[PDB]
Ligand binder design. Structure first.
Ligand SMILES: NC(=O)c1ccc[n+]([C@@H]2O[C@H](COP(=O)([O-])OP(=O)(O)OC[C@H]3O[C@@H](n4cnc5c(N)ncnc54)[C@H](O)[C@@H]3O)[C@@H](O)[C@H]2O)c1
Ligand SMILES: NC(=O)c1ccc[n+]([C@@H]2O[C@H](COP(=O)([O-])OP(=O)(O)OC[C@H]3O[C@@H](n4cnc5c(N)ncnc54)[C@H](O)[C@@H]3O)[C@@H](O)[C@H]2O)c1
Ligand code: NA
Ligand code: NA
Ligand code: NA
Lengths: 300, 372
């Protein structure tokens, strides 16, 4: 916070003016946080936890990082009287589906799960996984939230207003299209942001050599602010410019493109083979001005 | 530095490694390797052991894209680059994606599986427990079958931490895995390792000490639990030795040398705080500790809360002659076809029903392992 060089909170004024309702609403509410052991997900979870939630379940595929989340929560805040549980699960698995079928009762579902790295686009196999995790897992969990009568689904929008340049952004833009179809049935709000300092994946232990930033805690409050107070299709961002002081709001598909997407990806999976180029060609149909190029190819 | 923390000053396998270095280098340079769970704590270590000996082919697979980035950065600064086929893939071994990766390629000489769910608490609920069964039993059995299908010469994976009966579902899962492994070992050479505590491995109490220090939080550690500790590199060296030199069914493990001492977790914390330039302050309360953590680190003290509450049995066939530093158990565990089929049938049906209870799994585990 001072490590990135700043005096104060970005949202000093905004959470202040709403703290009591934030407190109020969290007290009487039930929360499912997907990807909750990730860098943004740990901060969102910690923001829900310190406000005394009635129910807070955290799901994340990383068994190790979840353990740390918990350790961190115990030291920071101690213990809470609501029902706080954690589950080291893959959101796309039968185990997660069983989890939901056995309970599934939440008011707010927040999804900070993702594959986000450029490594992950280099090969058709991880690229397919990125699609599963960023697009289809998001679509399925929104459906599950709808079927449970959740009030609100939060997720993290693309990082940029404009056109994706890589496969990760493209996957986020495609995810958004599936969101738009779902927003006919449940309120959906997103957060658009950039550069949470010290995020996972962003040397001294191993004696090896070694812009604007926001803190992890600031990223958790925004997601929370959008979750609780965001209207359907709202995208909250860090600064409708009149509702809040440091928070902005972007007020925000083709059925046949979505169908074509599910069909093509579906067939590739059935065939049990596909090339990166197949997927890239499909993306270009999905996103018209997709400014992906073959200049990466010439980079070693 | 890790060594000095675990009350030792010299590597464990310096003699066995040095004695076999030339042959290690010959083998690695003409062989293809697949490391599953290779972004994990032992995974990375064995991946580095392979990489530095200039392998023909080395493919790393793990669900953590973040820890993979760390593995590659570490490899780049430690060793640089090789001519051979080094690639990483952030894939879940249970997935269509991973199966399509194997169908397209799968051509490896040596397949190493350091993937797992390992936290005892992953027993809490029936959903995490089912995942642990999928990751520790079924993924292992499948990747072995995929290795037989591609003509791999050797599959390596981890053994149960102890020779004694399991006491929790974790150990039972690894014990059930071993039954599946024994069946597969009638078709391909399989060898394993049994490890001491690997110092600072991800998710461990020790790894926790780093986090606590980084987050200005109290250190918490049992003062009444002692363990043997090894370094990450030592874990990696043991994997590679069992991999390259293990015979079908050999369990490699570190001999208790005169250097290896039992040390308590509290004792490691104190050593570790002093190496960081801090003096431990013994607190007698969580609440106290939390408050003292805000101001004490400034004045070079750290609040501490110190709490309290065999690699081989005697009927195991050993080879203690082959290596100086490494012991070999000649595993002769058995399986019954019918109990393996039962387990696959009953687990498959729980998955079909989309519902199951913890106690249903426990009951199946009692049939699989009667003395559990
Ligand atoms: N950190 C930043 O500065 C930043 C900036 C812009 C956008 N974002 C976006 O915010 C989101 C989170 O970013 P992050 O920095 O927190 O990423 P992260 O890697 O730190 O956390 C992602 C989490 O998702 C989990 N996950 C992946 N697949 C899963 C699955 N199948 N089931 C359950 N969990 C799964 C991972 O274990 C990880 O904990 C991402 O979409 C990222 O693109 C982050
Ligand atoms: N660390 C120790 O002290 C220790 C001691 C004795 C035995 N062991 C055993 O050694 C093995 C590894 O220990 P570790 O300390 O390196 O654990 P670890 O948690 O650091 O690493 C396990 C790795 O497996 C990966 N993984 C899990 N599921 C996967 C999947 N479905 N697909 C792809 N990757 C997957 C994880 O992301 C992780 O990188 C485990 O069986 C453990 O029980 C460890
Ligand atoms: Na060869
Ligand atoms: Na092929
Ligand atoms: Na071949």
């Amino acid at each position: 916070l001072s490590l990135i060089g700043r005096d104060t909170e970005l949202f000093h004024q905004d959470i202040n003016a709403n703290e009591k309702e934030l407190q109020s609403v969290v007290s009487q509410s039930r929360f499912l946080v997907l990807g909750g052991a990730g860098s943004i997900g740990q901060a969102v979870t910690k923001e829900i936890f310190k406000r005394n939630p009635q129910k807070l379940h955290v799901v994340d595929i990383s068994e190790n990082n979840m353990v740390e989340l918990v350790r961190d929560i115990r030291s920071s805040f101690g213990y809470i009287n609501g029902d706080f549980q954690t589950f080291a699960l893959d959101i796309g698995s039968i185990e997660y589906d069983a989890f939901i079928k056995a309970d599934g009762q939440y008011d707010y579902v927040l999804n900070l799960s993702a594959l986000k790295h450029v490594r992950s686009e280099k090969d058709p196999f991880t690229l397919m996984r990125m699609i599963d995790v960023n697009v289809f897992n998001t679509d399925k969990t929104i459906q599950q939230s709808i079927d449970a009568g959740a009030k609100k689904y939060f997720c993290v929008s693309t990082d940029k207003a404009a056109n994706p340049v890589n496969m990760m952004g493209a996957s986020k833009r495609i995810m958004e299209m599936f969101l738009m179809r779902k927003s006919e049935e449940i309120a959906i709000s997103t957060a658009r942001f950039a550069n949470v300092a010290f995020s996972d994946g962003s040397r001294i232990q191993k004696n090896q050599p070694i812009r604007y930033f926001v803190t992890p805690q600031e990223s958790g409050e925004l997601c929370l602010m959008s979750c609780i107070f965001g209207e359907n299709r709202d995208i909250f961002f860090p600064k409708d410019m009149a509702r809040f002081d440091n928070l902005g709001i972007i007020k925000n598909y083709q059925q046949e493109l979505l169908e074509l997407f599910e069909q093509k990806i579906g067939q590739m999976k059935t065939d049990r083979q596909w090339t990166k180029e197949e997927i890239v060609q499909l993306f270009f149909i999905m996103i018209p001005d997709f400014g992906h190029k073959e200049t990466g190819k010439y980079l070693d």
